[PDB]
Each structure stands twice: as C-alpha cells, then as structure tokens.
Amino acid sequence: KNIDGYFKIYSKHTPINLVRDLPQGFSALEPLVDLPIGINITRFQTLLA
Amino acid sequence: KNKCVNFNFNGLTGTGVLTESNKKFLPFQQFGRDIADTTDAVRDPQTL
C-alpha cells in the first residue's frame, strides 16, 4: 500500500493444514517496514523461483 | 518520573505525570491512546 508516498508493508507467517488451497479462519497482519519512497506506482509483478 | 512535566516525546507534546507503565507496546509502536484518542502511554524515543 502506497500511503502518500509511504509504501508501508504488512506481513504475517503462520502454520496451516491445507484443505482447499486457502485455509479459513482469522489473523492479523503486523507492519513489516516503513518505506518513504515517494514514487507513484500503478502496476506490479511477482518474481517466481 | 513521578512529577508533572511539560514533555515532548519526539513530537508527542503534552503535559502530565510521567511514570513507568505496566502495559506492552508493539515492536514498531511509538505511543498509544485511550478510548478518547488521548495519549495514555508512550515509549521513549531512545529507550525501549
């Protein structure tokens, strides 16, 4: 999320017992790092291994 | 501590009685607020 140039990022890592490729429940994502970038973004792309 | 002071915790200005807290703040948290969005407890800018 780009917040007025602050590209704030949240994250969370938990265990699972996979059933339908998306286990249901509830959690909360914590802020990972503040990134005062100040650049506009309109698209993205993943880097697969 | 234990005195009424005019504090400025890196921008968080105000006036009150500063004392050691029994609560726990998040690792990336600077301060916290009560139900009325009033500064109830803060973390030192230098000390954790």
Q: Long-range contacts for B11-20 (Cβ within 8 Å, ≥24 apart)?
A: B12/B39, B12/B42, B14/B39
Method: cryo-EM
Q: Which residues of B touch A31 (CB under 8 A)?
A: 28
Tell how strand A9-11 and strand A6-7 pair up: unpaired
Question: Taking the mean position of all CA atoms in its chain, how far away is CA B19?
Answer: 9
**How far is the C-alpha of B43 from the C-alpha of B48, rounded, in Å?**
6
Please report the residues numbered 2 through 41 in chain A whose beta carbons come closer than 8 angstroms to any beta carbon of chain B: 30-31
Residue A36 gets which letter from DSSP? B
B28 touches chain A (CB under 8 A): yes
**How far is the C-alpha of A11 from the C-alpha of B6, rounded, in Å?**
37
Q: What is the CB neighbour count within 10 angstroms for residue B39?
A: 15
SS3 category, B10: coil
Using alpha carbons only, give the angle B9, B42, B12 rounded to the nearest 5 degrees. 35
Q: Which residues of B touch A30 (CB under 8 A)?
A: 26, 28
